[PDB]
Ligand binder design. Structure first.
Ligand code: 33Z
Ligand code: ZN
Length: 304
């Protein structure tokens, strides 16, 4: 029951990860990097033409449960990759030279909850000692100035930073995977909505990354490219000053691991629909986003 221009439930996305892999074994392999709190499988698709010691770009979607256009984008990206390989020169070179590690849904338990109970759920669905309140904000759960700012220590809050960095099985799983593959991973891209922004470090502090000028120029070029298609306007800059300070984010953590190209994407829109982006905008949203992602990929490849 899968469609690329509709939002798909987890059962459908899971079946899709199996199907798309089965149908494109020369471009995709599927693994599970762990289980969620509620025992769902955290799938990771390695997209690329297999070969020895290839560099890689890591991209995840679905950190936050209600940001459905994020999940949709990872699925869209994988189809574009497999459909255009061999026909579009850039994507062909991309997949020949590197792998994309695509994690289509990180926070699966929360995503399921937005389908079954509460469309505006954000956090994970793990239990918390001493309270009935459920869930941790996965993007406050990383070891990046953990919980020192822009985060709550209260499990009942939407930005609960957890009992400790990587207290969540899902964030632990992602961090473990990236740690185990640091040599290969050259960029980290994490997909969110909404706001139409590209953000780079830092968010947990007002300090700037050493390659700040490069990141600004890269984000500037990526947003220009994105705008070429439908005129969609993005802003960009360091997380802390571009949107708000917040510790424990994965982009900041990834960067401090040594991944020099680390970006948070905030997709459409600017609040007219917010998280409830109509399915009628999935195609255009994903198409323009593809251009920005491919631009960044092309740049990273030329800087290996
Ligand atoms: C709509 C976007 C902006 C999302 N924000 C929300 O859902 C926030 C979450 C929240 C809840 C209670 C108290 C504070 C914050 N809620 C909300 O209504 O946001 C509205 C809004 C809309 C536009 C601009 C600013 C805010 P996000 O995708 O969760 C933003 C994300 C994050 O908060 O994890 C983010 C943005 C930019 C950089 C980073 N990276 C980082 N390391 N912090 C992380
Ligand atoms: Zn988000």
């Amino acid at each position: 029951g899968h469609s690329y221009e509709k939002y798909n439930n987890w059962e459908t996305i899971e079946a899709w990860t199996k199907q798309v892999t089965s149908e494109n074994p020369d471009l995709i392999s599927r693994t599970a990097i762990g289980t969620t709190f509620l025992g769902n499988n955290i799938y990771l698709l390695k997209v690329g033409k297999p070969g020895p010691n290839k560099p890689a770009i890591f991209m995840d979607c679905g950190f936050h449960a209600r940001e459905w256009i994020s999940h949709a984008f990872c699925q869209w990206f994988v189809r574009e990759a497999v459909l255009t390989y061999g026909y579009e020169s850039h994507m062909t070179e991309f997949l020949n030279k590197l792998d994309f590690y695509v994690l289509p849904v990180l926070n699966i338990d929360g995503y399921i909850y937005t389908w079954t109970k509460n469309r505006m759920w954000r956090k994970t669905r793990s239990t918390n000692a001493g309270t009935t309140c459920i869930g941790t904000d996965p993007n406050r759960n990383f070891d990046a100035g953990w919980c020192t700012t822009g985060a709550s220590t209260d499990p009942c809050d939407e930005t609960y930073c957890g009992s400790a960095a990587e207290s969540e099985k899902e964030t632990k799983a992602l961090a473990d995977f990236i740690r185990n593959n640091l040599s290969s991973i050259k960029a980290y891209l994490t997909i969110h909505s909404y706001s139409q922004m590209i953000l780079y470090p830092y968010s947990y502090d007002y300090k700037l990354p050493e390659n700040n000028a490069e990141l600004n120029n890269l984000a500037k070029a990526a947003v220009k490219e994105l705008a070429t298609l439908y005129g969609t306007k993005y802003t960009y800059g360091p997380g802390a000053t571009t949107i708000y300070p917040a510790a424990g984010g994965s982009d900041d953590w990834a960067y401090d691991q040594g991944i020099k190209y680390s970006f948070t994407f905030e997709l459409r829109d600017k609040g007219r629909y917010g998280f409830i982006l109509p399915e009628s905008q999935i195609q255009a949203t994903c198409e323009e986003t593809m251009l920005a992602i491919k631009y960044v990929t092309n740049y990273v490849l030329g800087h290996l």
